[PDB]
Amino acid sequence: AWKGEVLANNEAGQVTSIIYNPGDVITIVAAGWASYGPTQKWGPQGDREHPDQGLICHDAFCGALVMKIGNSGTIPVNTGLFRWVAPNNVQGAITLIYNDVPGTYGNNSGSFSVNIGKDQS
Amino acid sequence: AWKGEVLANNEAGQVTSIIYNPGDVITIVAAGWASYGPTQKWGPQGDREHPDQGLICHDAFCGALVMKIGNSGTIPVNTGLFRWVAPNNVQGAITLIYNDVPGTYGNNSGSFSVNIGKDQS
Amino acid sequence: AWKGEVLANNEAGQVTSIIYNPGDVITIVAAGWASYGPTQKWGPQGDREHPDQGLICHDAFCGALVMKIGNSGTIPVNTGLFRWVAPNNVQGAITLIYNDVPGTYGNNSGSFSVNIGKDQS
Amino acid sequence: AWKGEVLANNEAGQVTSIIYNPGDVITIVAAGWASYGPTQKWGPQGDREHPDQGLICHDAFCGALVMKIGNSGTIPVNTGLFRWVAPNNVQGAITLIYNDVPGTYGNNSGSFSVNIGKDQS
Numbered sequence: 257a258w259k260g261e262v263l264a265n266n267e268a269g270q271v272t273s274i275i276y277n278p279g280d281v282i283t284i285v286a287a288g289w290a291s292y293g294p295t296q297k298w299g300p301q302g303d304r305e306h307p308d309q310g311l312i313c314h315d316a317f318c319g320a321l322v323m324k325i326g327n328s329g330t331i332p333v334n335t336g337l338f339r340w341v342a343p344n345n346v347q348g349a350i351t352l353i354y355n356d357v358p359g360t361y362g363n364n365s366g367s368f369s370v371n372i373g374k375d376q377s
Numbered sequence: 378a379w380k381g382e383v384l385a386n387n388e389a390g391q392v393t394s395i396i397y398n399p400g401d402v403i404t405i406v407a408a409g410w411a412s413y414g415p416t417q418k419w420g421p422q423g424d425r426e427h428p429d430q431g432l433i434c435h436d437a438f439c440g441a442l443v444m445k446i447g448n449s450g451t452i453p454v455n456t457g458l459f460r461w462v463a464p465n466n467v468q469g470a471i472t473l474i475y476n477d478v479p480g481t482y483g484n485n486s487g488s489f490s491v492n493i494g495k496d497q498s
Numbered sequence: 499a500w501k502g503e504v505l506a507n508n509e510a511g512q513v514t515s516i517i518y519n520p521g522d523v524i525t526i527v528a529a530g531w532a533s534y535g536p537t538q539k540w541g542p543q544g545d546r547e548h549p550d551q552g553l554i555c556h557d558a559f560c561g562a563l564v565m566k567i568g569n570s571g572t573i574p575v576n577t578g579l580f581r582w583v584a585p586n587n588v589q590g591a592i593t594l595i596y597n598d599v600p601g602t603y604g605n606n607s608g609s610f611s612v613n614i615g616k617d618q619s
Numbered sequence: 620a621w622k623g624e625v626l627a628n629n630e631a632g633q634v635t636s637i638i639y640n641p642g643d644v645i646t647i648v649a650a651g652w653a654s655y656g657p658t659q660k661w662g663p664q665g666d667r668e669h670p671d672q673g674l675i676c677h678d679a680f681c682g683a684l685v686m687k688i689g690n691s692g693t694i695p696v697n698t699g700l701f702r703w704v705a706p707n708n709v710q711g712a713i714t715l716i717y718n719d720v721p722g723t724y725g726n727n728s729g730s731f732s733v734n735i736g737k738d739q740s
């Protein structure tokens with residue numbers, strides 16, 4: 257299992273120790289408070305009012321938690337994944353990432369605390 | 378395992394099929410958008426910019442997801458619980474509850490989708 | 499999870515720390531060598547070439563591992579149960595027992611080693 | 620998980636759909652009756668009274684269930700493995716094999732039924 261923090265201002269995100277292998281079932285729980293610039297903070301689902309101005313993940317709000325598995329495209333995590341299995345032919349290390357516009361992470365703040373584990377399968 | 382909705386304006390909470398028994402380990406993941414009044418909506422962590430005016434759970438923000446197990450006091454859930462074990466002498470039906478001030482539920486809207494599962498022990 | 503030994507000579511059997519509750523999924527793995535009287539020893543499946551002369555469990559061979567959940571009747575365990583749900587409504591402490599005819603346990607010998615845990619549900 | 624059968628006269632063994640990966644925890648439960656040549660049949664622990672005359676696994680009796688993980692050596696399975704981690708960092712597909720002397724499988728009969736699953740990690 258893996259337990260850690262994902263920094264909102266980290267454009268490259270956080271490569272965890274979790275290698276998602278074919279057939280794996282995983283569970284992720286994410287918590288905390290982060291900002292993509294404003295004084296205000298949002299949780300791992302991000303800001304439902306802010307427009308997508310070129311986000312690394314277009315299927316989640318600005319300020320949401322997302323991930324990559326190996327060299328996959330971005331996949332929404334939001335508050336977490338419950339006994340989740342990946343789409344075909346997706347595998348590799350899980351990288352966790354705050355959803356913002358590339359080049360605009362510098363004014364970000366806060367973090368999410370995240371637990372990942374493998375479930376029975 | 379249980380999957381269901383928890384309505385923000387339901388003061389009674391939502392009873393799930395989950396009976397928490399001594400020794401049980403559980404995982405909860407909660408998602409979605411709800412309001413305790415304002416036209417704006419918050420995820421399962423609630424509104425961190427709002428004061429506690431006599432909330433059912435003082436250990437969570439207003440608009441947060443909370444729970445009771447049998448006749449326990451309120452326990453925070455927020456975005457979820459990862460492989461969690463209850464305090465001794467806490468057991469019975471899990472009821473999920475939106476965190477608000479009692480009697481002020483009428484102006485609430487939205488809801489959270491919540492998965493609960495028992496883990497290996 | 500529980501690990502312990504079940505003696506062939508114990509007509510009372512072995513209480514475990516596992517309480518089976520409705521909806522629980524369990525796994526048991528049993529190993530070792532025992533006898534209901536003969537010099538030869540058998541594993542937890544017992545002796546397939548021996549007639550049933552009034553065994554505590556008619557659905558398993560003489561010398562097999564069986565169990566009770568609370569005050570249920572006997573349920574075969576044999577070498578174990580993989581991610582098993584009680585097919586009947588039963589509840590309570592699992593007790594493990596060597597399958598022999600009551601009062602004939604005085605010539606029995608050996609024991610089985612047994613692991614039991616609850617699985618995700 | 621994988622649910623299948625292992626035939627006593629299959630010298631190569633049965634390749635399963637389970638790929639053991641680094642960090643995996645597995646549970647195996649095996650049942651049934653088989654023979655390495657005699658009339659009698661034995662369970663997945665094999666015959667504790669038969670000498671080792673060059674068995675493919677020296678850590679298990681003749682007629683026992685064993686396996687290989689990738690190009691590992693033979694690993695005893697017997698009645699099964701409870702929440703088990705592979706030693707020495709072995710990894711790869713799990714192949715299940717009846718323990719007998721190489722070239723003497725031709726007179727074998729019966730089978731074991733086997734369940735394999737991955738556990739939480």
Ligand SMILES: OC[C@H]1O[C@H](O)[C@H](O)[C@@H](O)[C@H]1O
Nearest residue numbers: 292293309318356357360363
């Ligand atoms: O839309 C994303 C964008 O939102 C605001 O304009 C922020 O101040 C920028 O840093 C960037 O995060």
Ligand SMILES: OC[C@H]1O[C@H](O)[C@H](O)[C@@H](O)[C@H]1O
Nearest residue numbers: 413414430439477478481484
């Ligand atoms: O702080 C609790 C309180 O918050 C706001 O004022 C809402 O209008 C009320 O309905 C109540 O939910």
Ligand SMILES: OC[C@H]1O[C@H](O)[C@H](O)[C@@H](O)[C@H]1O
Nearest residue numbers: 534535551560598599602605
């Ligand atoms: O059938 C059961 C019976 O089997 C033999 O007769 C044994 O010697 C007895 O002690 C009893 O275990």
Ligand SMILES: OC[C@H]1O[C@H](O)[C@H](O)[C@@H](O)[C@H]1O
Nearest residue numbers: 655656672681719720723726
């Ligand atoms: O020791 C193993 C050996 O045992 C007997 O002699 C069998 O007939 C052989 O086929 C072989 O399985």
Ligand SMILES: [Ca+2]
Nearest residue numbers: 292293360361
């Ligand atoms: Ca920004």
Ligand SMILES: [Ca+2]
Nearest residue numbers: 413414481482
């Ligand atoms: Ca309200």
Ligand SMILES: [Ca+2]
Nearest residue numbers: 534535602603
């Ligand atoms: Ca006896």
Ligand SMILES: [Ca+2]
Nearest residue numbers: 655656723724
């Ligand atoms: Ca043979």
